[PDB]
Amino acid sequence: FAPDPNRPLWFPGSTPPPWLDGSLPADFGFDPLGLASDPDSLKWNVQAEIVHCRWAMLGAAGIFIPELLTKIGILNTPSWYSAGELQYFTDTTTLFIVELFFIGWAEGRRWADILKPGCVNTDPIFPNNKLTGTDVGYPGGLWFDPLGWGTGSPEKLKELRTKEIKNGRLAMLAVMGAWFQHVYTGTGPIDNLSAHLADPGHATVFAAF
Amino acid sequence: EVKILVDKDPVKTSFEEWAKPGHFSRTIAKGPDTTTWIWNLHADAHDFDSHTSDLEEISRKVFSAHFGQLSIIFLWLSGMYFHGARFSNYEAWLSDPTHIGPSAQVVWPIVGQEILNGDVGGGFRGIQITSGFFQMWRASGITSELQLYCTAIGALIFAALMLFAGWFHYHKAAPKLAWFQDVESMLNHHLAGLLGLGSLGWAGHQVHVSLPINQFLNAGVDPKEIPLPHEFILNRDLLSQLYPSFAEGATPFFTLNWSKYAEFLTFRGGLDPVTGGLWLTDIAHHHLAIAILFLIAGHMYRTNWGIGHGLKDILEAHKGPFTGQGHKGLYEILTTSWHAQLSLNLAMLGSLTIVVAHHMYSMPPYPYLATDYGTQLSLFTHHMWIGGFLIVGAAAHAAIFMVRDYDPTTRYNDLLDRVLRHRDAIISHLNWACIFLGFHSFGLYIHNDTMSALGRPQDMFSDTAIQLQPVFAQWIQNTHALAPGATAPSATASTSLTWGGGDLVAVGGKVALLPIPLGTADFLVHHIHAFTIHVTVLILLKGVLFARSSRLIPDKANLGFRFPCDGPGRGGTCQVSAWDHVFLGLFWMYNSISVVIFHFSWKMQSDVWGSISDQGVVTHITGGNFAQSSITINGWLRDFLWAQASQVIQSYGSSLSAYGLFFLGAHFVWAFSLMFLFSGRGYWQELIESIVWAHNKLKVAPATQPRALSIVQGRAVGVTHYLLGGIATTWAFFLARIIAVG
Amino acid sequence: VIDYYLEKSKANKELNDKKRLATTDANFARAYTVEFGTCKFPENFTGCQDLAKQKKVPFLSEDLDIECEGKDIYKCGSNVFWKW
Amino acid sequence: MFLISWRGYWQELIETLAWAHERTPLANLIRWRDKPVALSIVQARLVGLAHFSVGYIFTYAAFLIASTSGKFG
Amino acid sequence: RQLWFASKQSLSYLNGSLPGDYGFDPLGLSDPEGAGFWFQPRWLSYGEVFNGRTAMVGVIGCLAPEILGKAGLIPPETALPWFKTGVFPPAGSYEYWADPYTLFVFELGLVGFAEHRRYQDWSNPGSMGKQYFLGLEKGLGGSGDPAYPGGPFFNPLGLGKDEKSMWDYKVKEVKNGRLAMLAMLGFFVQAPVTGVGPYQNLLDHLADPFNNNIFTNFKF
Amino acid sequence: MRDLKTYLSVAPVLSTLWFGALAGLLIEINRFFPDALTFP
C-alpha cells in the first residue's frame, strides 16, 4: 500500500489534499471540508467508513433481495419500512436489550482493537484460538476469514479492499434512497423502479405535484 | 481615474486563529493572567483602528463586518416572514382587521406557560404583536400565507448571499484603499442607484400589485377571490376596469399627457375613510416623484468624465470674513477618518429616526394602523429610543476622532481650529441656556404644585388661570389647515388631520385622528423637552470639545479616549475623559426620551384616541384629563403613573401576565445597577481578597486570579443595567395598558 | 369589476370562512402536535407538514384539503400546484 | 446626581463659568473672594448620601402618616 | 485603427492585440490594474466570445420553428414563438415526452459535465487530456487558449492553418457574436412589448411600416 | 480540524452546549413529571 500520486480523482484536473495521499484503498482525493486533516482523525474516519459500508451492505441486501422476491412470489415478506412495528415472539424492547448486550460485547472488543492494535486477538476462554489478522479493521482468523481470501499479495489486497469500500458507498447511498423513496412515494422500492421504467419521462421525483 | 481595485487572497482562511483568543491585538494574544483579560478581549473586539495602523486593513474589516450585519438582518426578516406564514392568524385578520388582534407567536405547553396564548380572536390563541407587520403586508398586497413563505425563503437565500460576500471580500477579493476613497462615485451610486432605483421599483410594485389588490380589499370582496398579482399583468383588461387609463398604455407617459393618469396618481391628502391611512394613490405618486428626484440628484459629482462637481472644490470655495479659510481641509479629514464619518452618519440617522417616528403617527401610511393603538405607541417609542441611542453614539465617535485622528500639522482645518479657540464661550453660553430653561420650565411645575397644594388654583399657570398659549405653533397649525385653498391649490386636503381642518376619521367605531389642540400644558411639556435636549447637548459637546486638553489637564490626549481619571490630584479628576461624558449623557438622553414618550402616551390617550358611537359622540380613553392634570407633578404621579399602571399590576392570571413579570424584573435590574453606579472597585477587590483566602484554604483557588471590574467597566455595567431596566419598565407598562384598554 | 367579485364573495362566504377557520386552527395546532399525539418521534422524521399529506394528521390535513376548493387549476393563491 | 456624576466633569465646567464671569461687562465690577471649585470626592459622597437619606425618610414618613390618617386603620 | 468612443484609460491596455478591438471601453472594465476573478482582461474576452457563440445559435433557435411553420414544412403545433415553447409557462407550454422539470435535470447533468470540464481547462490548461474519460480525453487537451481549444473534435476541419486566416476568422466570429447578442436583446425586449414572435414582428413591419414600430407600440 | 476542536473547547461554546443540554433535560423532566411540590 504505497503512495499513488497519479490515481483518478473525484474532480478531474484538481489537486488532492496533502493528507489524502493514495496509500489508502478507494482514495479519490475527496475531502473538501478537510475532515481528515489530522492523522488521528483520518485513522478514526477510515474505521468509521468501513463499518458503515459493511452495515449498509447488509442493510441493502436485507431491503432489496426480500422485496424483489415478494414481487415475484417466491416469498411473502412484509414491507421493510414497517417491519419494525410488527409483533414478534417477544416485545421489541427486550429484543433491543439483548441486541445491545451482544453487539455491545462485539463493539467493545472492536473498540479495544481500535485503541490498541494487538490487545484482543486471543480467545478469553481458550487461549489457543487466535485471530490471525494484522491491520485494524480486518480481524481475519477462522471466524472473520474462514476461506483465507483476506490475506495475499500487497497488490490484490488493495483492489479487494477498494471493491469493498466502493460497494459499501453504493449501498450507503441506496439505503437512504429507499428510505426517502418510501417516505415520499408511499410504496416499495421495486414498485418505484418498475413505475419509473414504465414512464421514465414522468415517473420521477417531480411526479408529486 | 475611477476603477475597480482589488487584491487577491490577502488573508488565508483557516481555523488556527479561532483557537488563539485575542489574536487581533499584541497584548491580549499572550493569554490571561487575571480575569481582567477576559473582559479586555470583548471590549476591544471591534476596535479595528487599535489592532492595526493600516487604513486599508481597517477599511476591509469594516466592509466585511457590514456584510455580516446584513446577513443577520436578512435572517431576522426571514424569521419574521416565516412566523407570519406558519404561526399567525394573518388570513383571519385580513377578513376582519377591526375585531381581530394580530398575533404571530405561539408558546409551547410547558411549566404552565401556555397561559400566554390569549384570545386574540379569529379562532386563534397566541401573543399579540405590536410590530405592525400585518398592516404592512396588507398594504403590499399580500393575501395568502404562501407568499410569506416564499419571502422567508428569499430572505434566507439573501442572508447566505451576504455572508458569502463578506467572506469573499475579506479573503478573496479585498478592495484597495483607493476604492474606498472614491467618495464621489459612492455618493452618485447611493443617490441614483440604491435610493432612486429602489423607490422606482417600489412605485412599480405599488401601481401594479398594491393598488388593485387594495382596491378589491377596500371594496369588501373576500381576500380569497381577489385575482393574484400576476393576473393584473397578464391580461391588462383586469387593470383597465379599476382604472380605464391603463388601456392607453405608456403613450400618455411619453407624449406628456400625465393628467390622464390622475386615476391612480393623485394629490389628495388626508386619510382613506374606509382604511384610516394615507391614500395608496398618493403614496405611489410620492415614490414615483422621489425616484426622479434622487435619479437627478445622483448625477451631481464628477467621477470619470468632465461633467460633475468636485467635493473638495465645493468645500474650498465656502469661506468668509468670520471663518478664515473656511471648509478647506475637510475633504482630507472625511476621506481618511472612519470615526468622523461614523459620527456624522450616526447623528443624521438618529435625527432621521425621530422624524420618522413623528411623521408615522400623524400620517399613518399603513391600512388599519391608526386604530391599532398598541402598534402606534410601540412604533413611536421604539423609533424614539433608536434615534436617541444613535445620536449619543455620534458624540462618542466624534470624541474618538478628536482623541485619535485629529492632527493639525497634516490635516488642518480652519473651522475646527476656530471652534477649539472659543470653546469656553460656547460651553458657558450653553450652561446659562440650560439653567434658564430648567428654571423657566420645571419651576413652573413646582409653582403650580405649590399653588394647588396651598388652595390657590387661580394663581397657577393653566388654561383657567394665568395662560401660556403656544401662539406660534397655533399659527403654524392654522396655516397648514388653510393650505389646500391658497398655498397648495392642487391638494384636496391638508397633509395631516391634526392641523385643525375640523374633521375626524373613524374606523370601526374607533377614532383614527382628529385636530390636536395645543394649550398651556403643551407649552409646558415642549419647553421641558427643549431643556432636556439642551442639557444632553451640553454634556456631549463639552466632552467632544475638551477631549484633547483643558485648563485642568493640559495633556488629556495622551491619556486616551477612555480612561478613568488622572488621580485624586487638583482636587479630584474623576470622569474627565470623553468616554465618561458619553456615559453621563446616556442618562440624560434616557430622561429626555422617557419624558417625550410619556407626553405622547398621555396626550394620545386623552385627546385623540377613543371610541365613537352611532350618534356622533366621542369618548376618549382618559376623557380629556391632560389639559388640567398634566400641569402639576402630582398630576403625572396620580393620573398618569398611578392610574394607568393599574393594568400591568392586575395582569396576573391572564394572557398579559408576562408584562407584570417583566415590570418587576425591570425594576429589579434598575435597582441592581445602583450597586455598580454608587460604589468603587477598591472595596470589591478587598472583599475578593477574603474569598480568595477561603478558596486557597480548600485548594480551589483558580490560576486566573480574580480581579474586581475596572473603574470604566463598572460605569459601563451600571449604565447598561440602568438603561435596560428603565426602558423595560416602560415597555411592559405601555404594552399592558394599551393592550388591555386599547 | 368590483360588483361582480362582490357577487362571487356573497356566494362563497361560508366556504371562505371554513378556509379561514381551518388555516388558523392548523397554525395554532402546529405548536400542540406533540401534546395532541399527532406528529411526534417515530413519524416526525420530516416536517409535520410533510406528514399532513401522507398520514392525515387531525388538524394539519383539514387545512390542506380545504385550502383550495372550488378554485381553478392555476388560481389558488395558497397552493402553487393545487391540481397539477 | 452626587452619587453618580463625579468631580472632574464639574471642575472643567466651573472653569468655563469663571471665564464667562471674568469676560462679562457690568459683572467684572464684582469679583469673588474664594476661588470657585467643585465639591471634593469625599464631600460629594457625603452630600449625596445626605440627600438620599433625607428623601428616603421624608417620602416614607409622608406615605405612612397619610395612609394611616386617611382611614385611621 | 478605427476607434469607437475610446479614452486615455481604454487605449492604455487596448492595443489591437484582440480580435474586434475598437478601443471601446467607457467604463474601464478591462483595466489590468487591480483586476481579478470576474473582472480580469482574460476572463472578459473569453466571456464575450463564449456568449456570442451561444447567442449565434440562439437566434436561429428562436427563428427556425416560426419561419418553418409559416411555410408548409413542419406541423403547425410544433411551430411556436420561442417564448411559447414552455420556457415561459405563463405564455403557454408544449407537451413533450418528459416533464419540463425532468428535462431540466437531464440538461443540468449533461451541460454540467460539459461546462465543468470546460472550466477546468481555464483553471488548469492541460489538465483534461490526462485523466481517463472513455478515451475522449485524447482530444480534450486544449491549446493553451481557453476560447480556442481546437483539436479533433472542436476544430475537426482544421481551418485557419496559417495565422492570417485564423485572425480574420476570429474577427468575423466576434463580430457575428456581437451582432447576434444585439439581436437576442431585441428579441427579449420585443417579446413583452409586442405579444407576437420576432418573425411576426418582422412581417408586420414590412406591411405597413409607419404603424408598426416603438412609437405605435407605446400602448402595450 | 484540530484547531476547530480547540475552538469548540473554549469557555463560551462549552458553556452554551452544557446549559442547553441541562435545560433540555429539565424541560423534558417537567414535561413528563409536571407540578412536583414534594418527593414521593
Ligand code: CLA
Ligand atoms: C430572529 C429570528 C428568529 C427568532 C427570534 C425566532 C424565534 C423562535 N422560533 Mg423561529 N425561525 C426563524 C427565525 C427566528 N425564530 C427562521 C429564519 C426560521 C426558518 C428556518 C424559523 C423557523 C422556525 C420553526 C419551524 C419553529 C420556530 C420556532 C420558534 C420559537 C421557539 C424556538 C425554540 O425553542 O428554539 C428551539 C431550540 C433550539 C434551536 C436550541 C438552541 C440551539 C443553541 C445553539 C444551543 C444548543 C444546545 C442544545 C439545545 C443542547 C443539545 C445539544 C446536543 C449536542 C446534546 C421562537 C419564538 C418554533 C415555534 O414557534 O414553535 C411553536 C418552531 O416550531 N422557528
Ligand code: CLA
Ligand atoms: C447602484 C449601485 C450600488 C448599490 C445599489 C449599493 C448598495 C449598497 N452599498 Mg454600495 N457601493 C457602490 C454602489 C452601490 N452600492 C459603489 C460604486 C461603491 C464604491 C464607490 C460602493 C461602496 C460601498 C461601501 C464601501 C459600502 C457600501 C454599502 C452598501 C449597502 C448599504 C446598506 C444598505 O442600504 O442596505 C440596503 C440593502 C439592500 C438594498 C439589500 C440588497 C443588496 C444589494 C442589492 C446588493 C448590491 C449589489 C452590488 C450593487 C453589486 C454586486 C456585485 C456583483 C458582482 C454581484 C447597500 C447594499 C455598505 C455596506 O453595507 O456594505 C456591505 C458599505 O460599507 N457600498
Ligand code: CLA
Ligand atoms: C453603527 C454604529 C456603531 C458602530 C459601528 C460602533 C463601533 C464602535 N464603537 Mg460605538 N457606539 C454606538 C454605535 C456604534 N459603535 C452608539 C449608538 C453608542 C452610544 C450608546 C456608542 C458608544 C460607544 C462607546 C462609549 C465606545 C464605543 C466604541 C466603539 C468601538 C469598539 C466597539 C467594540 O469593541 O465593542 C465591543 C462590543 C461589546 C463589548 C458588546 C457590548 C454589549 C452591550 C453593552 C449590551 C447591549 C444590551 C443588549 C441590547 C441587550 C441584551 C440583553 C441580554 C440579557 C442578552 C467601535 C469602533 C468604544 C471605543 O473604544 O471606540 C474606539 C467605546 O469606548 N462606542
Ligand code: CLA
Ligand atoms: C431630580 C434630580 C435632579 C435635579 C433637580 C438636577 C438638577 C440639575 N442638573 Mg442633574 N443629574 C441628576 C439629577 C438631578 N439633577 C442625576 C441623577 C444625574 C446623574 C446622571 C445628573 C447629572 C447631571 C449632569 C451631568 C448635568 C446635570 C445638570 C443639572 C442642572 C441643569 C440646569 C438646571 O435645570 O438648573 C435649574 C435648576 C433646577 C431645575 C433645580 C430645581 C430648582 C427649582 C426651581 C426650585 C428652586 C427654588 C428656590 C431656588 C429654593 C430656594 C429656597 C431657599 C431656602 C434655599 C441642574 C442643577 C447639568 C448642569 O450643571 O448644567 C448647568 C449637567 O451638566 N445633572
Ligand SMILES: CC(/C=C/C=C(C)/C=C/[C@@]12O[C@]1(C)C[C@@H](O)CC2(C)C)=C\C=C\C=C(C)\C=C\C=C(C)\C=C\[C@@]12O[C@]1(C)C[C@@H](O)CC2(C)C
Ligand atoms: C449516506 C451515508 C453517509 C453519507 C455521507 C456523505 C455523503 C459525506 C460526505 C462528506 O464527508 C465526506 C465524504 C468528505 C467531506 O469533506 C465532505 C462531505 C460531503 C461532508 C451513510 C449511510 C449509512 C447507512 C447505513 C449504515 C444503513 C444501514 C441500514 C441497515 C443496517 C438496515 C437494516 C434494515 O433494513 C433491513 C436490513 C431490514 C429492515 O426490515 C430493518 C432495518 C433495520 C431497517
Ligand SMILES: CC(/C=C/C=C(C)/C=C/[C@@]12O[C@]1(C)C[C@@H](O)CC2(C)C)=C\C=C\C=C(C)\C=C\C=C(C)\C=C\[C@@]12O[C@]1(C)C[C@@H](O)CC2(C)C
Ligand atoms: C447569450 C445570449 C442569449 C443566448 C440565448 C439562447 C441560448 C436562447 C435559447 C432559446 O431560444 C432557444 C434556443 C429556444 C427557446 O425555446 C428556449 C430559449 C432558451 C429561449 C445573449 C447575450 C446577450 C448579451 C448582450 C446583449 C450583451 C450586451 C452588452 C453590452 C451592450 C455591453 C456594453 C458595454 O460592456 C461594453 C461593451 C463596454 C463597457 O465599458 C460599456 C458597456 C456599455 C457596459
Ligand SMILES: CC1=C(C/C=C(\C)CCC[C@H](C)CCC[C@H](C)CCCC(C)C)C(=O)c2ccccc2C1=O
Ligand atoms: C458588584 C461590583 C463588582 C463585583 C462584580 C463582579 C466581579 C462581576 C463579575 C462576576 C460575574 C458573576 C462573572 C463571574 C462568572 C464567570 C465568568 C463564570 C462562572 C461560571 C458559571 C457560574 C457560569 C465590581 O468589581 C465593581 C467594580 C467597580 C465598580 C463597582 C463594582 C460593583 O458594584
